[PDB]
């Protein structure tokens with residue numbers, strides 16, 4: 023997979039110098055690169071969501087207007103959903119549609135496999151704020 | 162799971178050669194040593210290179226902990242004896258999320274321990290050199 027900074031440069035969203043500044047800043051915080059670029063004023067939140075979706079080849083969703091399957095939600099117990107920042111929003115056959123705010127999180131991906139074994143997975147990316155509101159709404 | 166396995170990553174990015182990888186895989190068997198450390202022992206890879214490519218493999222950043230922002234109030238959430246055992250330092254807290262620097266974020270045995278030790282906090286992981294972690298323990302406890 024292409025790295026996010028390189029993607030944003032190739033797409034003309036940030037310059038090489040801006041990317042280097044953010045990478046240097048990140049070495050001193052450990053915050054995510056996209057979040058760092060937003061702090062520096064070089065990237066917007068909407069761009070971050072859209073370009074993450076492009077990097078990972080996942081759809082963006084507006085959960086605030088989505089119609090969530092309320093019988094799919096409980097397949098992932100609340101304690102795990104909140105911890106992993108993941109919400110099961112649909113079930114077709116044995117494929118679950120799962121919204122995540124950090125779908126690039128390797129350890130969350132590993133955990134989800136452990137918590138929801140034997141299902142097919144389709145992922146969509148949502149803003150963390152919408153996920154958090156979703157947990158309150160659907161549990 | 163699934164990360165790209167480390168050998169293939171290092172070969173594809175032109176860090177180690179195919180024959181060297183095969184040599185290290187052969188040599189690693191039943192030594193108790195992981196692949197990166199085997200490659201380093203054979204002189205094909207450096208500690209810094211291993212750090213940087215583990216970070217790429219695990220999709221996390223390397224930090225310079227000697228200069229990094231550390232919430233010195235967040236540090237004590239993990240008692241010193243556990244921080245030292247697990248080679249893990251809590252450097253940020255916000256809501257129920259902790260940012261944790263580890264020398265080995267691939268250490269799942271340590272991760273399990275960290276999880277049971279800091280329950281009801283979720284984690285964001287970053288990697289730092291072990292020397293910097295230990296200096297951090299001396300500095301923040």
Ligand SMILES: Nc1nc2c(ncn2[C@@H]2O[C@@H]3COP(=O)(O)O[C@H]4[C@@H](O)[C@H](n5cnc6c(=O)[nH]c(N)nc65)O[C@@H]4COP(=O)(O)O[C@H]3[C@H]2O)c(=O)[nH]1
Pocket residue numbers: 023024025026027028029045048053054055056057058070074077123124125126127216217220221222223
């Ligand atoms: N939800 C969310 N996801 C985000 C954000 N920023 C980055 N990501 C996604 O999450 C992964 C980890 O980001 P990171 O912690 O900044 O960790 C990054 C970062 O430290 C660094 N990195 C990212 N892009 C570049 C680059 O163009 N050049 C270099 N040298 N390093 C890069 O390598 C690590 C892995 O990069 P990736 O493969 O791109 O993988 C990224 C990316 O897929 C964010 O603000 N929010």
Ligand SMILES: Nc1nc2c(ncn2[C@@H]2O[C@@H]3COP(=O)(O)O[C@H]4[C@@H](O)[C@H](n5cnc6c(=O)[nH]c(N)nc65)O[C@@H]4COP(=O)(O)O[C@H]3[C@H]2O)c(=O)[nH]1
Pocket residue numbers: 164165166167168169170182186194195196197198199211215218264265266267
């Ligand atoms: N802190 C630290 N972490 C390390 C080091 N070396 C590897 N790791 C990480 O820890 C996991 C286990 O390494 P392993 O015991 O060598 O066990 C490895 C190794 O025996 C083997 N492996 C790795 N790469 C290759 C490869 O390219 N070809 C083959 N045939 N086997 C491979 O598969 C197992 C799993 O590989 P991975 O998915 O890459 O998962 C690796 C990797 O993420 C190290 O020196 N220090």
